[PDB]
Enzyme design. Structure first.
Site, PDB file in Angstrom:
ATOM      1  N   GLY B   8      35.863  58.306  54.384  1.00  0.00           N
ATOM      2  CA  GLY B   8      36.764  58.982  53.830  1.00  0.00           C
ATOM      3  C   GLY B   8      36.848  59.510  52.660  1.00  0.00           C
ATOM      4  N   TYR B  15      41.780  59.361  46.373  1.00  0.00           N
ATOM      5  CA  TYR B  15      41.487  57.588  46.190  1.00  0.00           C
ATOM      6  C   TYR B  15      40.124  57.237  46.635  1.00  0.00           C
ATOM      7  CZ  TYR B  15      46.462  57.281  44.830  1.00  0.00           C
ATOM      8  OH  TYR B  15      47.561  56.921  44.506  1.00  0.00           O
ATOM      9  N   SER B 119      39.543  54.818  53.804  1.00  0.00           N
ATOM     10  CA  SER B 119      40.388  55.685  52.818  1.00  0.00           C
ATOM     11  C   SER B 119      40.441  57.029  53.552  1.00  0.00           C
ATOM     12  CB  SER B 119      39.733  55.988  51.513  1.00  0.00           C
ATOM     13  OG  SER B 119      40.369  57.006  50.775  1.00  0.00           O
ATOM     14  N   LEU B 120      41.286  56.972  54.686  1.00  0.00           N
ATOM     15  CA  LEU B 120      41.488  58.274  55.582  1.00  0.00           C
ATOM     16  C   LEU B 120      42.570  57.983  56.451  1.00  0.00           C
ATOM     17  CD1 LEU B 120      40.094  57.654  58.787  1.00  0.00           C
ATOM     18  CD2 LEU B 120      37.955  57.304  57.413  1.00  0.00           C
ATOM     19  N   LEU B 169      44.266  52.278  52.577  1.00  0.00           N
ATOM     20  CA  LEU B 169      45.087  52.736  52.106  1.00  0.00           C
ATOM     21  C   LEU B 169      46.274  52.944  52.996  1.00  0.00           C
ATOM     22  CD1 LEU B 169      44.286  53.202  49.114  1.00  0.00           C
ATOM     23  CD2 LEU B 169      42.368  53.613  50.499  1.00  0.00           C
ATOM     24  N   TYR B 171      51.011  53.826  52.825  1.00  0.00           N
ATOM     25  CA  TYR B 171      52.261  54.280  51.918  1.00  0.00           C
ATOM     26  C   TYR B 171      53.478  53.714  52.448  1.00  0.00           C
ATOM     27  CZ  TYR B 171      54.860  58.130  50.019  1.00  0.00           C
ATOM     28  OH  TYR B 171      55.751  58.827  49.393  1.00  0.00           O
ATOM     29  N   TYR B 181      57.112  63.050  55.713  1.00  0.00           N
ATOM     30  CA  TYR B 181      56.016  62.457  56.065  1.00  0.00           C
ATOM     31  C   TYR B 181      56.081  62.320  57.433  1.00  0.00           C
ATOM     32  CZ  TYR B 181      52.393  58.889  55.089  1.00  0.00           C
ATOM     33  OH  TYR B 181      51.135  58.477  54.841  1.00  0.00           O
ATOM     34  N   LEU B 219      49.908  60.733  44.745  1.00  0.00           N
ATOM     35  CA  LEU B 219      48.530  61.371  44.133  1.00  0.00           C
ATOM     36  C   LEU B 219      48.406  62.944  44.604  1.00  0.00           C
ATOM     37  CD1 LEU B 219      46.070  60.800  41.945  1.00  0.00           C
ATOM     38  CD2 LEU B 219      44.698  60.539  43.994  1.00  0.00           C
ATOM     39  N   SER B 221      46.022  64.632  45.914  1.00  0.00           N
ATOM     40  CA  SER B 221      45.065  64.908  46.713  1.00  0.00           C
ATOM     41  C   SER B 221      44.958  66.066  47.192  1.00  0.00           C
ATOM     42  CB  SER B 221      44.711  63.538  47.453  1.00  0.00           C
ATOM     43  OG  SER B 221      45.527  63.390  48.411  1.00  0.00           O
ATOM     44  N   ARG B 222      43.733  66.621  47.909  1.00  0.00           N
ATOM     45  CA  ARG B 222      43.610  67.816  48.792  1.00  0.00           C
ATOM     46  C   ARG B 222      44.660  67.684  49.944  1.00  0.00           C
ATOM     47  NH1 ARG B 222      41.879  68.170  52.394  1.00  0.00           N
ATOM     48  NH2 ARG B 222      42.882  69.900  53.759  1.00  0.00           N
TER      49      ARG B 222
HETATM   50  N1  LIG Z   1      47.250  60.610  48.046  1.00  0.00           N
HETATM   51  C1  LIG Z   1      48.226  60.053  47.970  1.00  0.00           C
HETATM   52  O1  LIG Z   1      49.284  60.749  47.463  1.00  0.00           O
HETATM   53  C2  LIG Z   1      48.373  59.033  48.966  1.00  0.00           C
HETATM   54  C3  LIG Z   1      49.468  58.165  48.972  1.00  0.00           C
HETATM   55  C4  LIG Z   1      49.341  56.837  49.884  1.00  0.00           C
HETATM   56  C5  LIG Z   1      48.375  56.901  50.680  1.00  0.00           C
HETATM   57  N2  LIG Z   1      47.246  57.659  50.770  1.00  0.00           N
HETATM   58  C6  LIG Z   1      46.406  57.460  51.816  1.00  0.00           C
HETATM   59  O2  LIG Z   1      44.851  57.338  51.087  1.00  0.00           O
HETATM   60  C7  LIG Z   1      43.888  57.556  51.944  1.00  0.00           C
HETATM   61  C8  LIG Z   1      42.892  58.762  51.420  1.00  0.00           C
HETATM   62  O3  LIG Z   1      43.844  60.065  51.410  1.00  0.00           O
HETATM   63  P1  LIG Z   1      43.869  61.105  49.998  1.00  0.00           P
HETATM   64  O4  LIG Z   1      45.391  60.999  49.658  1.00  0.00           O
HETATM   65  O5  LIG Z   1      42.953  60.252  49.089  1.00  0.00           O
HETATM   66  O6  LIG Z   1      43.194  62.512  50.517  1.00  0.00           O
HETATM   67  P2  LIG Z   1      41.831  62.624  50.989  1.00  0.00           P
HETATM   68  O7  LIG Z   1      41.749  64.128  51.257  1.00  0.00           O
HETATM   69  O8  LIG Z   1      40.744  61.685  50.534  1.00  0.00           O
HETATM   70  O9  LIG Z   1      42.098  62.069  52.508  1.00  0.00           O
HETATM   71  C9  LIG Z   1      41.310  62.145  53.645  1.00  0.00           C
HETATM   72  C10 LIG Z   1      39.950  62.070  53.624  1.00  0.00           C
HETATM   73  O10 LIG Z   1      39.357  61.191  54.497  1.00  0.00           O
HETATM   74  C11 LIG Z   1      38.336  62.239  55.265  1.00  0.00           C
HETATM   75  N3  LIG Z   1      38.583  62.126  57.007  1.00  0.00           N
HETATM   76  C12 LIG Z   1      39.641  62.536  57.626  1.00  0.00           C
HETATM   77  N4  LIG Z   1      39.702  62.505  58.870  1.00  0.00           N
HETATM   78  C13 LIG Z   1      38.569  61.702  59.045  1.00  0.00           C
HETATM   79  C14 LIG Z   1      37.569  61.350  60.193  1.00  0.00           C
HETATM   80  N5  LIG Z   1      38.191  61.173  61.333  1.00  0.00           N
HETATM   81  N6  LIG Z   1      36.406  60.563  59.847  1.00  0.00           N
HETATM   82  C15 LIG Z   1      36.002  60.453  58.566  1.00  0.00           C
HETATM   83  N7  LIG Z   1      36.675  61.058  57.649  1.00  0.00           N
HETATM   84  C16 LIG Z   1      37.694  61.666  57.691  1.00  0.00           C
HETATM   85  C17 LIG Z   1      38.809  63.668  54.640  1.00  0.00           C
HETATM   86  O11 LIG Z   1      37.640  64.501  54.883  1.00  0.00           O
HETATM   87  C18 LIG Z   1      39.298  63.324  53.472  1.00  0.00           C
HETATM   88  O12 LIG Z   1      38.212  63.343  52.596  1.00  0.00           O
HETATM   89  C19 LIG Z   1      44.810  57.901  53.492  1.00  0.00           C
HETATM   90  O13 LIG Z   1      44.799  57.017  54.169  1.00  0.00           O
HETATM   91  C20 LIG Z   1      46.154  58.304  53.070  1.00  0.00           C
HETATM   92  O14 LIG Z   1      46.843  57.972  53.840  1.00  0.00           O
HETATM   93  C21 LIG Z   1      47.397  58.542  49.890  1.00  0.00           C
HETATM   94  C1  LIG Z   2      47.278  66.776  58.272  1.00  0.00           C
HETATM   95  N1  LIG Z   2      47.593  65.921  57.644  1.00  0.00           N
HETATM   96  C2  LIG Z   2      46.641  64.940  57.082  1.00  0.00           C
HETATM   97  O1  LIG Z   2      45.468  65.183  57.613  1.00  0.00           O
HETATM   98  C3  LIG Z   2      46.930  64.053  55.984  1.00  0.00           C
HETATM   99  C4  LIG Z   2      48.397  64.017  55.533  1.00  0.00           C
HETATM  100  C5  LIG Z   2      48.591  63.044  54.697  1.00  0.00           C
HETATM  101  C6  LIG Z   2      47.380  62.147  54.119  1.00  0.00           C
HETATM  102  O2  LIG Z   2      47.647  61.155  53.224  1.00  0.00           O
HETATM  103  C7  LIG Z   2      48.714  60.893  52.364  1.00  0.00           C
HETATM  104  C8  LIG Z   2      48.665  61.804  51.199  1.00  0.00           C
HETATM  105  C9  LIG Z   2      49.756  61.690  50.485  1.00  0.00           C
HETATM  106  C10 LIG Z   2      50.751  60.555  50.467  1.00  0.00           C
HETATM  107 CL1  LIG Z   2      52.207  60.426  49.498  1.00  0.00          CL
HETATM  108  C11 LIG Z   2      50.610  59.568  51.485  1.00  0.00           C
HETATM  109  C12 LIG Z   2      49.464  59.945  52.460  1.00  0.00           C
HETATM  110  O3  LIG Z   2      49.221  58.948  53.692  1.00  0.00           O
HETATM  111  C13 LIG Z   2      46.292  62.313  54.816  1.00  0.00           C
HETATM  112 CL2  LIG Z   2      44.854  60.991  54.015  1.00  0.00          CL
HETATM  113  C14 LIG Z   2      45.979  63.206  55.700  1.00  0.00           C
END
Ligand SMILES: NC(=O)c1ccc[n+]([C@@H]2O[C@H](COP(=O)([O-])OP(=O)(O)OC[C@H]3O[C@@H](n4cnc5c(N)ncnc54)[C@H](O)[C@@H]3O)[C@@H](O)[C@H]2O)c1
Ligand SMILES: CNC(=O)c1ccc(Oc2ccc(Cl)cc2O)c(Cl)c1
Ligand SMILES: NC(=O)c1ccc[n+]([C@@H]2O[C@H](COP(=O)([O-])OP(=O)(O)OC[C@H]3O[C@@H](n4cnc5c(N)ncnc54)[C@H](O)[C@@H]3O)[C@@H](O)[C@H]2O)c1
Ligand SMILES: NC(=O)c1ccc[n+]([C@@H]2O[C@H](COP(=O)([O-])OP(=O)(O)OC[C@H]3O[C@@H](n4cnc5c(N)ncnc54)[C@H](O)[C@@H]3O)[C@@H](O)[C@H]2O)c1
Ligand SMILES: NC(=O)c1ccc[n+]([C@@H]2O[C@H](COP(=O)([O-])OP(=O)(O)OC[C@H]3O[C@@H](n4cnc5c(N)ncnc54)[C@H](O)[C@@H]3O)[C@@H](O)[C@H]2O)c1
Ligand SMILES: CNC(=O)c1ccc(Oc2ccc(Cl)cc2O)c(Cl)c1
Ligand SMILES: CNC(=O)c1ccc(Oc2ccc(Cl)cc2O)c(Cl)c1
Ligand SMILES: CNC(=O)c1ccc(Oc2ccc(Cl)cc2O)c(Cl)c1
Lengths: 289, 289, 289, 289
Positions: B8, B15, B119-120, B169, B171, B181, B219, B221-222
């Site tokens: 991911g 992340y 990380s997905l 990962l 939350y 959320y 963070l 992230s996209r």
């Molecule tokens: N960004 C935050 O603020 C935050 C906070 C808490 C938890 N998280 C968690 O961090 C993890 C990564 O998310 P992120 O925020 O870094 O953004 P991210 O864009 O890296 O998250 C999704 C990534 O995984 C890939 N992905 C989605 N579906 C998939 C699948 N079926 N198979 C393979 N790859 C796939 C996407 O291409 C994308 O690169 C997630 O588990 C999310 O819940 C993020």
């Molecule tokens: C259609 N939505 C999504 O695909 C989605 C939404 C949120 C996602 O990750 C997070 C991004 C930010 C935070 Cl605060 C917690 C998360 O779990 C992720 Cl990794 C994906």
């Protein structure tokens, strides 16, 4: 006048029944939501009076059952019903058994209710452990045990007055591992426990309706015997009756009396909580020995 | 020689990337698992060197990326692949992207690995709140965000030496409600956090392999920007940078350095845990004010 | 015939009072334990009719106070009595106010009881934050607000029937940080919550007696205002009513109704539990505004 | 250049020692705080070569102890010193052993430090269960095992750099009941765990300094055997190795390696946390056997 809908009883050997008995103790009208596989059998039993003993609320009161209704917590609305369950022997002769439908059915027969009980779990693959559970089995375990509550809430929340109250049953394996509780059941209870919070926020601000979940001790219910991991449940029960702070048999009625309180106004300030009704077994770290 | 598979990443704004950078800092070979929608774009970017800045591990070391592989955490094996994803423009020109397949692919190219990163997350219906989420959306959120870990474990556990280590990962919304959320994401993280325990038991006794989950702060992230509830994420970040014990920008690299430690032997006695990497935001009850 | 000792009131403005009102509703004799410095002052107000409005249990019944007694949660026995409290204006003209003393006094006058309430707290240094709290202050907080419970249980368990029930109040500051809740109160509450489990075991195994703790939301009681940190307490009520899942105003009776439940046979299956009665505030992470 | 004060050793058989060994691995000067009654006895063994085997950091480096100092976690300052400890055989020929005193002594000899360890505990009455624990004993447990931390932080924060790090050890008996862990130790641990959060806030906001607590599994240290409740501790190790997710033998170094991590910049994003380092025992509910 007080009405409760109890989703998920097939017999008198469950927590649903316990819940049903205690509510009667408080003169609340009980509507049963029966899964259609076990429904006709259940009426058959009822008509024949197999439950007459079991309907005894000691104090010369007979359990007051308003109505018994077919119900399948897997179908939200009519169009969710597949064409094999349209054909099925058990479901053929029955109507209005989806969540939307029984919601409408109850509302039109009796008006708004104020109490809701989710006493059902189901996990196809409970015998195979988490690691060896297929996507299909997991998601099915989550659909049936976790999502059903959410959907129950969406639909019934239209047929409930404010100050109403909802409960579900959960198990401590969501917080601590219990080998044997497989097929995603633990995942499902974990999800259920989390949704209980989220929903408490939405149902609270928007409807002034409370929702909590009861974390039960073990009870030799039909479904518990089907976990069939002398079994997971007989072990779960010996351990409990020997390692719990409270060394007394845990009864279905013990869950009811608590479920009753939550469903009442007496718990008007509790919402979003997982309440352990389990003779304190969850507080222990090590066996005494 | 040390190998990690990171499932991911689609960019360097996540992340996953943070995790990837810190592991390099410790001379561990990084294999990328890219979702096929964003894959060709990602190679295109890489070849063109858009990530050259982002691959800078300060200390005159270049990020060492062993391999980049298509990967879809929704398909366990080849027969799980539907005939629309067989046709799809993005998936047409790609092979070996299921969990079973990439597991075999990696194993045959490089042998056993010892580090695994999940990380997905993905939830179709994240914008609609829990109450208004359809069965389909929920289960899909659970399939993609929760089950995928379990399946990753089943398959990769054959290509891992003992003393290996896995992270996911999560939350804090699984434990405490965060409006916005939605779509079952909270349910999914709740399930993930529970499965992390159960799996820790099975993976431990059977494989001497550890598994933990990191509970991150926010963070930009996209994927976070796509929650699109100036947004849920920009708010989540201001609150955090103002109400956290640690009043410093939370960086992707901050998760990595922790993810790194867990993946190493240094954490040989930690397993089943949710570890908060979030500047302590979770410990707070009320804003200072 | 049912008797409850409530230790820890000085007026009608607190939780002990709400707890008391709700017990009368079930026709349970109440015995009040009052901190000696304020007991004469309390009897004065009692004699002069000041609590008469507050004593109505709506439905045409006066609150049935059985007795009011001087009670100090810092001395266990006669010889625990220091010699400036031999001298003190307030304590002088009073006797038998230690824990063992009032246990015996009660026992002697009325025999066996079956409902205990710890509803008292004190942290001398509450206004100073934990870092600036002295040994003296910290320890006096823990003696007054935590060890007093154990002491109660130790001495009261002699004068109780099997199946009896105990509660204590507590505040979520033990689990999540509330800036302003200093002096070691949070520390005290944490030890209480944990002691409640441990006690549950000993009290449950050995005496078949249950014990739980109610974690309440803010209430403008005399001592809440004495926090004095507008006030710490004005903030907490304000926030709670903007943010708690439930819009309504929290009442000592809301907590009272819950205490009444925990104290009855209707909860025989619950012990060692922290029950939150806070309109669900504890389940929230961030505010929406 | 990195200095760590470890308060709370008397030998090589404990956690402070494992913590110490693992810090040497990163070339961080260690300063030991020894409880006065056992300090001379400790220097004797030190002088006589008894710890030389134990001091090897495998890879051809001796453990670099910077200094060993008399240190008593029950007195904060000079005037906190009672007058039988003016008299006591053991303390007589010693000076500057109070918390403020050793903070100043260290500061004076070596300047600013940046890594603090609270690794001490005492509950005089540990063998008596909580119900039978006296005020004196309870409170002395809390002074010695909880308030000492805050005291350390209060006095050491003056001699630390920004970004510094603090740890304390703790035991899961605070969260789940361990029969045999009496005297108020459990109480003490609970207050510690909570104080860790609260401190995190003040220390984090005001000093950009982090603080966490390591919750370890059983280890046959001198004091674990002094529990003496075979032994309480023989049972705990036995059970842990039959039941913990991870079959392996827990080592003070296992905890040491984790402490080393928490104490470094590599965790700048973690504070206010209880980290479990117990081979995952804490995640289990029931045993399988
Ligand atoms: N960004 C935050 O603020 C935050 C906070 C808490 C938890 N998280 C968690 O961090 C993890 C990564 O998310 P992120 O925020 O870094 O953004 P991210 O864009 O890296 O998250 C999704 C990534 O995984 C890939 N992905 C989605 N579906 C998939 C699948 N079926 N198979 C393979 N790859 C796939 C996407 O291409 C994308 O690169 C997630 O588990 C999310 O819940 C993020
Ligand atoms: C259609 N939505 C999504 O695909 C989605 C939404 C949120 C996602 O990750 C997070 C991004 C930010 C935070 Cl605060 C917690 C998360 O779990 C992720 Cl990794 C994906
Ligand atoms: N029995 C125990 O020891 C125990 C312990 C903890 C929690 N629980 C929980 O208690 C609840 C009730 O289970 P139980 O043990 O009383 O046994 P049970 O046999 O009453 O449980 C299942 C009941 O719900 C019905 N049901 C199943 N799927 C349904 C569906 N899709 N739609 C409608 N009804 C359906 C079944 O007919 C059955 O009557 C469950 O949530 C379970 O997780 C039970
Ligand atoms: N009011 C709130 O906002 C709130 C919220 C959470 C928890 N609590 C808890 O509820 C309980 C009830 O307190 P309250 O808030 O109603 O205030 P209150 O003033 O009504 O009662 C507290 C009582 O504790 C008494 N007390 C102190 N030391 C004593 C001693 N040695 N012996 C006997 N009594 C003693 C005080 O005299 C006072 O009467 C307390 O434990 C408090 O910590 C209150
Ligand atoms: N060993 C285990 O099984 C285990 C498990 C969980 C937690 N812990 C915790 O780990 C920490 C380290 O203890 P240990 O188990 O390694 O035993 P240990 O004997 O190695 O160290 C405990 C030390 O605390 C010291 N101490 C007591 N009062 C003091 C004072 N006033 N000033 C300075 N030092 C003082 C004792 O002298 C002793 O040296 C303790 O806090 C303990 O509670 C231990
Ligand atoms: C195929 N399996 C099932 O359908 C099943 C399994 C267990 C069920 O409930 C429980 C029964 C016993 C316990 Cl200990 C916990 C439970 O959640 C339920 Cl209600 C159903
Ligand atoms: C010097 N300070 C005190 O004596 C004090 C402070 C607070 C007290 O109870 C509470 C009052 C309000 C809240 Cl929120 C929580 C509480 O525990 C109580 Cl009962 C006493
Ligand atoms: C009189 N008793 C004691 O002094 C005592 C008891 C236990 C101590 O540490 C532990 C030792 C073993 C465990 Cl399992 C947990 C602990 O906290 C410590 Cl450090 C001291």
């Amino acid at each position: 006048e007080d009405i409760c809908f109890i989703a998920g009883i097939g017999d008198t050997n469950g927590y649903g029944w316990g819940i049903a008995k205690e509510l009667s103790k408080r003169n609340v009208k009980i509507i049963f939501g029966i899964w259609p596989p076990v429904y006709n059998i259940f009426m058959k039993n009822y008509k024949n009076g197999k439950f007459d003993n079991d309907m005894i609320i000691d104090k010369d009161k007979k359990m007051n059952i308003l109505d018994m209704l077919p119900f399948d917590a897997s179908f939200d609305t009519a169009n969710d019903i597949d064409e094999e369950t349209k054909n099925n022997k058990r479901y053929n002769m029955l109507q209005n058994y989806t969540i939307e439908d029984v919601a409408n059915l109850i509302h039109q027969k009796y008006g708004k209710i104020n109490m809701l009980v989710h006493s059902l779990a189901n996990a196809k693959e409970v015998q195979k452990d988490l690691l060896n559970t297929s996507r299909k089995g997991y998601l099915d375990a989550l659909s049936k045990s976790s999502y059903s509550l959410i959907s129950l809430c969406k639909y019934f929340v239209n047929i409930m007055k404010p100050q109403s109250s909802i409960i579900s049953l959960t198990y401590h394996a969501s917080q601590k591992v219990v080998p044997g509780y497989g097929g995603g059941m633990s995942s499902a209870k974990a999800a259920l426990e989390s949704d209980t919070r989220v929903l408490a926020y939405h149902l609270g601000r928007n409807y002034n309706i409370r929702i909590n979940t009861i974390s039960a001790g073990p009870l030799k219910s039909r479904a518990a015997t089907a976990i069939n991991k002398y079994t997971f449940i007989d072990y779960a029960i010996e351990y409990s009756e020997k390692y719990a702070p409270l060394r007394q048999k845990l009864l279905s009625t013990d869950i009811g009396s608590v479920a009753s309180f939550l469903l009442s106004r007496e718990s008007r300030a509790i919402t979003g909580q997982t309440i352990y009704v389990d003779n304190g077994l969850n507080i222990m770290f090590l066996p005494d020995d």
